[PDB]
Amino acid sequence: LFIQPFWKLRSNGDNVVVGDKVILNPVNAGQPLHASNYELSDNAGCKEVNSVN
Amino acid sequence: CNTSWKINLFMQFRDHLEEVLKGGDVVRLFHAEQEKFLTCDEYKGKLQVFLRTT
Numbered sequence: 680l681f682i683q684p685f686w687k688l689r690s691n692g693d694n695v696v697v698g699d700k701v702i703l704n705p706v707n708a709g710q711p712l713h714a715s716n717y718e719l720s721d722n723a724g725c726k727e728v729n730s731v732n
Numbered sequence: 733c734n735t736s737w738k739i740n741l742f743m744q745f746r747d748h749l750e751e752v753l754k755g756g757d758v759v760r761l762f763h764a765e766q767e768k769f770l771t772c773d774e775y776k777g778k779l780q781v782f783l784r785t786t
Binding site: 688 | 764765
């Protein structure tokens with residue numbers, strides 16, 4: 680997972696600081712992780728995580 | 733004449749480094765998130781500060 684800046688303050692090559700908002704982009708899939716809004720039927724109140732823009 | 737000149741210190745030689753922020757420096761504030769420069773201009777007879785869209 681490439682760890683990439685989400686803020687314009689940080690830039691490529693900068694050390695990651697605790698508490699920073701970052702984006703995890705899979706090397707192969709190429710689409711950042713995303714917490715879907717589709718509620719899971721098996722467990723109520725639980726969402727899903729999938730790779731998409 | 734009898735005029736006397738008093739030496740008032742504003743900045744020392746050690747603090748005159750070009751790699752640090754110093755009093756009196758002319759710099760502009762750039763908003764990284766919005767990618768806009770801080771600016772102030774007269775709009776309706778009163779000077780107002782804002783970020784200018786480019």
